[PDB]
Design a protein around this ligand. Structure first.
Ligand SMILES: Nc1ncnc2c1ncn2[C@H]1C[C@H](O)[C@@H](COP(=O)(O)OP(=O)(O)OP(=O)(O)O)O1
Ligand SMILES: Nc1ncnc2c1ncn2[C@H]1C[C@H](O)[C@@H](COP(=O)(O)OP(=O)(O)OP(=O)(O)O)O1
Ligand SMILES: Nc1ncnc2c1ncn2[C@H]1C[C@H](O)[C@@H](COP(=O)(O)OP(=O)(O)OP(=O)(O)O)O1
Ligand SMILES: Nc1ncnc2c1ncn2[C@H]1C[C@H](O)[C@@H](COP(=O)(O)OP(=O)(O)OP(=O)(O)O)O1
Lengths: 673, 673
């Protein structure tokens, strides 16, 4: 019943020694943890050869790519991995990896893969042919300079993408196909979110008889029962719809028995016209979209609300409904004060900066509220009848540490390797049950790259989070990031000579995206910021012009490059902070079982106590301006999370909302208190 | 606010005039009803021609088959229909037809089709070419000698047609998707759809990689219960299964929130081995059927329990579970004492008399608990992968009056016409979303014929319901019915020369079904019974031998012929009793709205008060013996309904259950109290 030694040592840090914390004990706890639990459950082997032979003959490793080299080259790779003599810096830095991510045995009671093992297996998977490139991947990963995404880091060479985005056309057959594909992807563990734009609303005619449709709530009920069957997503909705009130009455603290969704989140799509009507204090008109489909032939949100709203008001054919926008934003503020639900996307900020609006305009987002790409709906006909295949969105992920990049200045080569890595991942991927995801993943070739560790590095260097210097720093940094990113994409496009489809329809072929960079140079405006990037080259606008010419030579290989995800579950292995959202508390406290695990933030010393500010004690406006400065280079959304208090006000909340709409923040997240 | 005249006249019957009822007022109420509500809402026309032209040009009648004759022949058919000068005998005899079944207008406020109209349209639909045959259908129907089934009587020549669907669910994710798809497809067609969950793996079991991963049968029931709420059937289960207790905990008066099915009924399949184990007071062993599928390759209920039960006990591979059968029948008696749920099928009584056991054995039944045919499961593979098509069951229905048959002695010609009618109906049927139903309905060609009006005719003639004379009467009657039925099937088989597939595999080609009729002649054993059939020919066993030879010449066209359904909703139009179940109460009382509609049973006079017995005051054993005498000629099940009282006993209930198992009653129904 006694608590073991390392947990007891980890509980020692809260003892006040001269008003401080016992940080130096922490390593000792880690030095306990590698003696009394880890090195007494590892399966023992003589050397490498039999080890790998035992790993093959019990159905663990996919033996194909592990047969495509010599034994000696793999031995050199493992030798390069063990030559680091790597150590962990913190207590959770081991515990989150040797409990869940690292490979266990069949009885789930022993440990096979060491920390070099998993990384070097990932390295040979990203190699696909070159030994020295695999060594480059090792030197990239073992210095914690790059982190692949969660399911890629898990399921490399065992028995892959955690983000799926679909559309539901309007038929019975379409709803059947949708529930089919959701149950298919549900066992694959990824993130699956739907959208209910083109559906007819409640109390409407079904092809023969008026007032026959049970509406959106029944489809939500079927999906809520549907995800309860397998190993949880969400759904979005554009606001110009009658049942939007019933779409928002689901998340309710006085929850109805039938109106009860504990699985799917919800979210609202809002263009500028509704914002205008809520500002100027006038009426609003939600519609019956099936009447619009009968009238104009197209669907509702496939046209501009700013161009067509009063024209639909003027049409006697479209049956309408008048409501109050201001009371509706008040109700949104109340429901976000309850939890923070739903999600919010401002599409006009997105499409006016989007490159690929010539295919379609972005209407929705994933569960992770980040990926904003084109989407064409399919049409699933009857059994012997053939179908028509639209386009879908499937985004594999991956971020990186800012800190080690700043330590080593190999940011270019880092992007060079990570781009090829995610390229080979999207090469490898295949799904054999949803054909539109198949066609789009072959077609669009969308990769997603981001970064964590913003708060901690700049807080450890002694720069406040609300400083303008950090905003200029992030501006110059992400400018150079996007620069080398497009540079590598153009290089690979020259290597293959095969861009994505309808490349001339993009703004990339015209250089309209490049028109921001031909002027308005992003040189550092502070000396202390300039000392940080001091020691390496920073490009000029003429370098952007040479880049524009080199793009105009061939083109770009990818259609999308960047994403920012709240990668907290693999934040702990990199032993760092979250992404760009600053930290909540200086000390995290968990109870694994009969235990009080005490996690300090990395870099917690006496001097930098003030730069480790608290999330409840910050200017939200400067945070939004930081995220807007970050937004200057990112194609997709940014995982912006609101940090609130009970003492705050929905007046101030909606002021922050309209402030972010005025700045141009794409999406937000669930709010915390 | 005043009650109209005819309802006030209909409420007059409960006034005691010399201790009697005001029967003679009732016709007066009917004579009121054709003056003050019906003949003041009929759309008025000059004559036939413009009438039909107006009916075409507003999308009511399917104009194809109504273009395949002359105008004059249709005029002769309508003239023959109006030449009857038909009247209704009772008050509900109009009210159940001019309120729901007869055709209304688009605003649902006026009446177009008269009572001749609907019948003669059905007549021309059954004609398909011959005017005189249509006149024969008129002379059949307008004397109330035959009644087609409910959706055929509704949707003839309008804007599917068979109210009975039976499916199977193979074991995959894809199969469950296909099952929910087909259920939602048939749900808008309004028919009866019931499933079966035999071949599914049970709760807490391995899903292909990881032990204890299956949520079990309850989640699939939850999905189906949500599924039918969107657009109502049932499902069956064989008892040798671990989750059978959880399969019976759904219908519970102390209902759980999650375990709550207000839509689907449930039912139990029981062979003789479990009956034996419950009698002899020993243990029982339910199984994990996926282990059996891994062991023997086949599925569980595709083999004999009597041959394999102890062999599965002897296998160490099959994981088992020991339970008490006697306490389980006690729990069944308790749950039937709660409501009467679930349903019960004794398959060994069925298969030992079934002709077509060479294809498969019957495992389940429909919602109406009557149709017991073969069923091969399909296998629904992935998207580009092709599937394999099994066999399904789809049974259109139809019964007849016994009374007018006894009045006119045209029983042979009646069967001659009704067989061709249901034949043409099964010709006409097509569904374009469930391919196995398509293939089976083309293949098996199963028709279903029955009869109502057993209790009332023999009660009006002055013969008690519990008499042996009625049992001999029904024996001789249904013997001759089945005789002429097989005679007409052989005639049509000679007409086409194309029997159903695998006809030589049947017992009909071998005459093993005919071996009962070569001896043991069913001559009437009472003089009073013999006077009823007196005046017409009754066949002999040598006539059965000639029938056997004529069958051996060609064969039989159909694989199934007979069914008995509780056709109460179209009992009222024929102005008669139900089918073979005797009546509950002598007077039915309903409240349409602010009203007390008082329905007397037909033939209610002072003399026959005693022969109109009450259902709570009868010998159940003689009822079961009556149904067993009826069972001597019917291939399918019989809609046997239990009539119980609160003063009765589950001891006596289970005694009746085992009594019916000893007699050989196929299925039972929900019990009433
Ligand atoms: N933080 C850590 N990360 C990884 N391994 C660790 C960590 N802490 C201890 N160990 C491992 C390494 C060794 O196998 C064992 C402890 O030996 P350790 O003292 O840490 O290495 P070392 O040999 O380089 O130092 P020393 O020479 O002082 O013994 O457990
Ligand atoms: N029985 C039903 N109950 C509820 N909703 C239904 C039902 N049947 C169909 N629907 C709903 C969901 C469908 O998306 C929508 C239309 O159904 P569906 O028949 O598949 O469209 P359709 O392609 O045949 O033609 P249309 O565009 O005129 O509706 O109404
Ligand atoms: N039970 C009924 N069934 C059908 N129609 C009826 C019924 N009762 C009354 N009517 C109809 C028939 C007529 O159109 C009208 C009533 O006339 P009705 O007296 O019944 O016929 P009738 O003309 O043969 O008798 P009578 O010569 O004595 O008037 O309503
Ligand atoms: N994620 C899941 N959650 C619950 N049940 C599942 C899940 N995935 C599959 N199943 C259930 C329902 C399926 O009928 C059953 C097996 O699934 P499935 O993969 O379709 O079978 P299979 O044809 O691929 O091979 P096998 O016969 O070995 O199961 O287990």
């Amino acid at each position: 019943n006694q608590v073991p030694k390392w947990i007891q040592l980890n509980n020692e840090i809260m003892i006040q020694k001269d008003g401080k914390f016992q940080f130096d004990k922490d390593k000792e706890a880690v030095h306990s943890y590698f003696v009394d639990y880890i090195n007494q459950n590892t399966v023992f082997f003589h050397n490498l050869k039999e080890k790998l032979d035992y790993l093959v003959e019990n159905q663990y490793y996919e033996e194909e790519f592990l047969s495509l080299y010599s034994f000696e080259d793999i031995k050199e790779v493992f030798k390069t991995a063990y030559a680091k003599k790597f150590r962990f810096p913190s207590f959770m830095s081991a515990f989150k990896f040797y409990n869940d991510y690292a490979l266990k045995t069949n009885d789930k009671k022993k440990i096979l893969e060491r920390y070099e093992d998993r990384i070097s297996i990932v390295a040979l998977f990203f190699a696909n042919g070159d030994t020295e490139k695999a060594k480059e991947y090792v030197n990239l990963m073992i210095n914690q300079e790059y982190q692949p995404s969660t399911p890629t880091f898990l399921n490399a060479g065992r028995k892959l993408v955690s983000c799926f985005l679909l559309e539901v056309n309007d038929s019975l057959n379409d709803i059947s196909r949708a529930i089919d594909i959701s149950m298919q992807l549900s066992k694959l563990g990824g993130g699956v979110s739907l959208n209910l734009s083109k559906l007819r609303a409640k109390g409407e005619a079904i092809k023969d008889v008026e007032n026959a449709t049970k509406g959106v709530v029944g489809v939500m009920k079927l999906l809520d029962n549907a995800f309860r069957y397998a190993d949880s997503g969400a759904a979005y909705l554009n606001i110009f719809h009658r049942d939007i009130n019933d779409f928002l009455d689901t998340k309710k603290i006085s929850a109805d028995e039938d109106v009860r969704v504990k699985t799917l989140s919800i979210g609202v799509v809002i263009p500028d016209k509704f914002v205008e009507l809520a500002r100027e204090d006038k009426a609003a008109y939600v519609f019956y979209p099936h009447t619009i489909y009968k009238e104009y032939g197209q669907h509702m949100d496939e046209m501009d609300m700013n161009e067509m709203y009063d024209k639909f008001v003027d049409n006697p054919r479209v049956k309408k409904e008048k409501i109050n926008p201001r009371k509706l934003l008040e109700k949104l503020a109340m429901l976000r004060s309850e939890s923070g639900y739903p999600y919010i996307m401002f599409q006009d900020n997105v499409n006016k900066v989007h490159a690929n609006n010539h295919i379609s305009k972005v209407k929705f987002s994933n569960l992770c509220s980040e990926v904003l790409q084109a989407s064409q709906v399919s049409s699933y006909t009857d059994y012997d009848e053939e179908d028509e295949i639209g386009l879908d969105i499937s985004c594999n992920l991956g971020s990186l540490n800012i800190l080690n990049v700043m330590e080593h200045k190999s940011i270019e080569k880092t992007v060079k390797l990570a781009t090829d890595s995610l390229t080979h991942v999207s090469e490898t991927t295949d799904i054999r049950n949803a054909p539109a995801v198949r066609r789009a993943n072959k077609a669009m070739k969308s990769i997603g790259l981001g970064a964590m560790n913003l708060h901690g590095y700049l807080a450890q260097n002694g720069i406040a989070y609300e400083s303008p210097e950090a905003r200029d720093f992030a501006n110059t940094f992400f400018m150079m990031v996007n620069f080398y990113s497009i540079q590598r994409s153009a290089e690979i496009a020259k290597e293959k000579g095969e861009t994505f489809d309808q490349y001339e329809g993009s703004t990339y072929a015209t250089g309209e995206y490049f028109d921001k960079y031909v002027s308005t140079d992003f040189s550092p405006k502070y000396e202390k910021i300039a000392n940080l990037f001091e020691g390496m080259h920073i490009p000029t606008t003429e370098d952007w012009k040479k880049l524009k010419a080199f793009v105009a030579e061939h083109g770009m290989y990818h259609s999308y490059r960047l994403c920012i995800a709240p990668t907290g579950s693999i934040s702990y292995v990199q032993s760092s902070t979250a992404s760009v959202m600053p930290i909540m508390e200086r000390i995290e406290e968990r109870t694994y079982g009969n235990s009080k695990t005490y996690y300090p933030m990395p870099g917690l010393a006496s001097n930098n106590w003030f730069f480790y500010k608290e999330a409840y004690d910050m200017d939200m406006f400067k945070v939004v301006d930081m995220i807007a400065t970050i937004q200057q280079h990112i194609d997709q959304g940014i995982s912006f999370t609101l940090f609130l208090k009970d003492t705050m006000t929905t007046r101030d909340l909606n002021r922050i909302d309209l402030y972010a709409h005025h700045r141009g923040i794409k999406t937000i997240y669930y709010a915390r208190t």
